[PDB]
Ligand binder design. Structure first.
Ligand SMILES: *[C@@H]1O[C@H](CO)[C@@H](O[C@@H]2O[C@H](CO)[C@@H](O)[C@H](O)[C@H]2NC(C)=O)[C@H](O)[C@H]1NC(C)=O
Lengths: 215, 217, 194, 218, 211
């Protein structure tokens, strides 16, 4: 009957200080122990440490002892994960898990906190059309050179959903993300139907409606 | 530091069949010798926080469907999913909680199984608007294919290119259980306009021979 | 037919740590919800078992250990802990499965006179085994000469008195600790949840 | 009666190990709290470690993981393993009987542990000449110069311990060279310079050096 | 870490007077304090435990007072053997810590130093090093200013001073200042003077020799 809520997504430069939050709400938080799990992009779950809010007993994994500090504030039922000098390796999503005792399974989980250490700023994406020159043909849009994630792409303001494949972002060597979204349409509708991709990037306040048509 | 290694890394099971994930423990995981192994199994759907399924090696969490079952003792443990359904596609981790250094397994990706389907290959030349900025991006699309393993090579004027391509793969489609891949070749305007033919060669299990889609600048 | 958890926690008086009381709880239904959801506990630490999942399991017997210690000594009521309380007063096994519930009792167990009848064991030649109770009041012989029952050189009274005062720091303030232990032996079960 | 005698101190290179022994009498070491306290060569007292009567061991933060305290009931001796010694560990280590981890009612004489990469060197003894510039009326001043030795201590006697009145042996001073210098001067009647003979007995056991230097009027 | 601050750093009183020593703590320890006496060359001896209780074999003239953060050690009718460095130790919190200690010296009529100067030995001159030693003998108070002046030029950076403990008989101090130079530097000068400034001296006294 207990729930956990974490802090918002953080974007930081290397060497900065960070401190993410995890506040619990429910009946019985006094018995619950809070632990922090790190999951690098495309990687598995890594257990970092656990703390008891009542007495602030911090048990650390040997892999995260001298590189992170776990604290808590029992007054506000909040646990904290803090870095002094952020490194590019610490770019990962962090979950705080709830367990009502040491050596007990973790029942309650937080939604996760996304941390990005990149040495980049906020830049608006550039949307380029993919030429529909193809039984059936396919078209799409190229979302390139943006930071940070995420980017939401829709076709005809959400009217076209069947046959749409929006690929996950890929981090280029420039430090900026690229994305491609494509749809599958009958080859008889190229000249008649008009296809427009709606690319929105809230971090940059960018909204581009890009029309695509055969060259 | 109790090590947990689980096998297989990848598992392909059809709908309505049984999927088994084994977890091997470096050291025995039992607390107070009460015949209770302190192990847990977690389910993590793509883009969602992990959810606890089984604790103490045989006890289902509240609301877990009956098709999930835990088994094992000592250092050998297993999780079995009888009658696999489409909503069970996730990565499963075995995690021990009998010692202060909590440990997870490396994970086991679970995918539904499909009668092999060949990719639909399309190639997109860089747009004129992008060409003004001085950068050219060539996109090759592999649509609705299975299995996920696919080889894409960029050959410009029949010369293999390397280090200037990045691939992106979507998750399995929720209905036809097919994959999609996008390979993007990024070049400057000078390098792009130094060649004529850009080809995308695809090697896949569902293709009798490699399929090449090319265009001339 | 509920288990008498009120007797242990809502007790008018508490025993010293060297003579810790244990109440055997059996043949009753244990409703832990009245216990674990209270906000009056400074520390509620469980080992091996989880209180949120006790209203569904069963056990043959449940033990509740009551004593009064200092705030600095609450850390010692835990498996694999060393110290005067842990070695000579109350020792928990390394494989302990249960909970330790402690709350401040400055309002109850303190007196402005600077003293109280709460005692702990200061001298002992060997450490206590888990769940062992030593209530000896015999002069501790620190030398080779027999003490003959009279305190003196190399002959000290084994027990010491807490100076519980309301003006002391939080660490020095008296804390009431209740230790819940769950026993499972091959026998009919007598304690189950709601 | 209670006696505590210590042994095992000396010069040791940084990182090298050492073990300090403490012979105990008048009480049973297996039944009493015992502690090791070190006093720096100039600074205050610091509690290092303690062993309970039941056998539990507790260590200070600056020595945890490197120092191990132990007792031998058969030999009635307290021990202290040093393992990874540091220059900051250079001090005089005391063996004290602890009363319930509260206070130290009895103390041993203390043994000196010096941790430094410096090498043992014998002292050079030079005579402080009694002259017209060291004599005034009947009062005449003479001494010896114990210079450039390591490690401490150095004991200085005059005429094989027969002369002890008016003898001032100054505390050793650590020079910039990393060695110790010391002087020992006495006050004698001016009429005794030509008749009496004054010799300073310098002994430096760590270097096995014994020097008897005669001082003569200039 | 809880720090015990002792005041004053040093105390000067005549025998038969009353000594009051202070020991303040970072946090409240509530009478969990001990007092020790350490004469030079010896180990500490327990004096007071419980911040008020006297250790066995200790005379009644030693008393402990105070609680919490403020503690006082009072010695009445000081005897010449009751002068040493006194440390206070708390045992109310781990780690158990000591104070810096308070030196207790006896007090005497201001006694002028007797200045003696020793030229470097010919034997030491052979090794290539010269050491000139200036002796201040049987003076009080301890504070003394010694300056090395060679050819009437002040010398700094090549002199070290050593001060003895208070003598048991005349209650004075002795100071040794040694000026160390190489033979080349030593034979580049003629007059080596030791200038001594002290409270008991009407004017500074200088003893000098020629090489
Ligand atoms: C001690 O007794 C008090 C009442 O004096 C109990 O507190 C109440 O318990 C009832 C049920 O017995 C609850 O409905 C109330 O909400 C409780 N009130 C508060 C303020 O907690 C208390 O539970 C008893 N302590 C125990 C059983 O440990």
């Amino acid at each position: 009957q207990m729930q956990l809520v974490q802090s918002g997504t953080a974007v930081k430069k290397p060497g900065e200080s960070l401190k993410i939050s995890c506040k619990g709400s429910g009946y019985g938080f006094i018995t619950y122990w809070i632990a922090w799990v790190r999951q690098m992009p495309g990687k598995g779950l890594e257990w970092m440490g656990i703390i008891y809010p009542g007495d602030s007993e911090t048990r650390y994994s040997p892999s995260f002892q001298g590189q992170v500090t776990i604290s808590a504030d029992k007054s506000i039922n909040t646990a904290y994960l803090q870095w002094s000098s952020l490194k590019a390796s610490d770019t990962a999503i962090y979950y705080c898990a709830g367990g009502s005792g040491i050596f007990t399974p973790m029942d309650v989980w937080g939604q996760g906190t996304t941390v990005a250490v990149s040495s980049a700023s906020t830049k608006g994406p550039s949307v380029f059309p993919l030429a529909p020159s193809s039984g059936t043909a396919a078209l799409g849009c190229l979302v390139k050179d943006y930071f940070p994630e995420p980017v939401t792409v829709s076709w005809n303001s959400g009217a076209l959903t069947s046959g749409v494949h929006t690929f996950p972002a890929v981090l280029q060597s420039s430090g900026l993300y690229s994305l491609s979204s494509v749809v599958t349409v009958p080859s008889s509708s190229l000249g008649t139907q008009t296809y427009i991709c709606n690319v929105n990037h809230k971090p940059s306040n960018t909204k581009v409606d890009k029309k695509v048509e055969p060259k | 530091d109790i090590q947990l290694t689980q096998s297989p890394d990848s598992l392909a099971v059809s709908l309505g069949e049984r999927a088994t994930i084994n977890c091997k423990s470096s050291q025995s995981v039992l607390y107070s010798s009460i015949n209770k192994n302190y192990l847990a199994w977690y389910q993590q759907k793509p883009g969602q926080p992990p959810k606890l399924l089984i604790y103490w090696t045989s006890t289902r969490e509240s609301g877990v469907p009956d098709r999930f079952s835990g088994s094992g003792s000592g250092t050998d443990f297993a999780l079995t999913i009888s009658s696999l359904q489409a909503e069970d596609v996730a990565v499963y981790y075995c995690q021990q909680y009998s010692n202060t250094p909590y440990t997870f397994g490396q994970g086991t990706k679970v995918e539904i199984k499909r009668t092999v389907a060949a990719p639909s290959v399309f190639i997109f030349p860089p747009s004129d608007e992008q060409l003004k900025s001085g950068t050219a991006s060539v996109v090759c699309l592999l649509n609705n294919f299975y299995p996920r393993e696919a080889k894409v090579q960029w050959k410009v004027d029949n010369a293999l290119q390397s280090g200037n391509s990045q691939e992106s793969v979507t998750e399995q489609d929720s209905k036809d259980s097919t994959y999609s891949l996008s390979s993007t070749l990024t070049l400057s305007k000078a390098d792009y306009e130094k060649h004529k033919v850009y080809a995308c060669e695809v090697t896949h299990q569902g293709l009798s021979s490699p399929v090449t889609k090319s265009f001339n600048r | 037919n509920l288990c008498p958890f009120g007797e242990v926690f809502n007790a008018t008086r508490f025993a010293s740590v060297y003579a810790w009381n244990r109440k055997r709880i059996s043949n009753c239904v244990a409703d832990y919800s009245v216990l674990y959801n209270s906000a009056s506990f400074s520390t509620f630490k469980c080992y091996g078992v989880s209180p949120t999942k006790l209203n569904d399991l069963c056990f043959t017997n449940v033990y509740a250990d009551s004593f009064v210690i200092r705030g600095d000594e609450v850390r010692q009521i835990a498996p694999g802990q060393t110290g005067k309380i842990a070695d000579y007063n109350y020792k928990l096994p390394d494989d302990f499965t249960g909970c330790v519930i402690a709350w401040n009792s400055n309002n109850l167990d303190s007196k402005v006179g600077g003293n109280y009848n709460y005692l702990y064991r200061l001298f002992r030649k060997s450490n206590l085994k888990p769940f062992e109770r030593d209530i000896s009041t015999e002069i501790y012989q620190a030398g080779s000469t027999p003490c003959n029952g009279v305190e003196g050189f190399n002959c000290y009274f084994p027990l010491q008195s807490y100076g519980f005062q309301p003006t002391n720091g939080v660490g020095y303030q008296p804390y009431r600790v209740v230790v819940l232990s769950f026993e499972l032996l091959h026998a009919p079960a007598t304690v189950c949840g709601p | 009666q209670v006696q505590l005698v210590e042994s095992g101190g000396g010069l040791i290179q940084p990182g090298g190990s050492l073990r300090l022994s403490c012979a105990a009498s008048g009480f049973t070491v297996s039944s009493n709290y015992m502690s090791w306290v070190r006093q720096a060569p100039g600074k205050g007292l610091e509690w290092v470690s303690v062993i309970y009567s039941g056998g539990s061991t507790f260590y200070a933060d600056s020595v945890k993981g490197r120092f191990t305290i132990s007792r031998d009931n058969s030999k009635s001796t307290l021990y202290l393993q040093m393992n990874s010694l540091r220059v900051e560990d250079t001090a005089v280590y005391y063996c004290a009987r602890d009363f319930g981890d509260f206070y130290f009612d009895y103390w041993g004489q203390g043994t000196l542990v010096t941790v430094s990469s410096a090498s043992t060197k014998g002292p050079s003894v030079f005579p402080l000449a009694p002259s017209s510039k060291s004599t005034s009326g009947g009062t005449a001043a003479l001494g010896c110069l114990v210079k450039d030795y390591f490690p401490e201590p150095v004991t200085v006697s005059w005429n094989s311990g027969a002369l002890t009145s008016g003898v001032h042996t100054f505390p050793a001073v650590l020079q910039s060279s990393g060695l110790y210098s010391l002087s020992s001067v006495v006050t004698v009647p001016s009429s005794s310079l030509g008749t009496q003979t004054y010799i300073c007995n310098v002994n430096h056991k760590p270097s096995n050096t014994k020097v008897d230097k005669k001082v003569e009027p200039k």
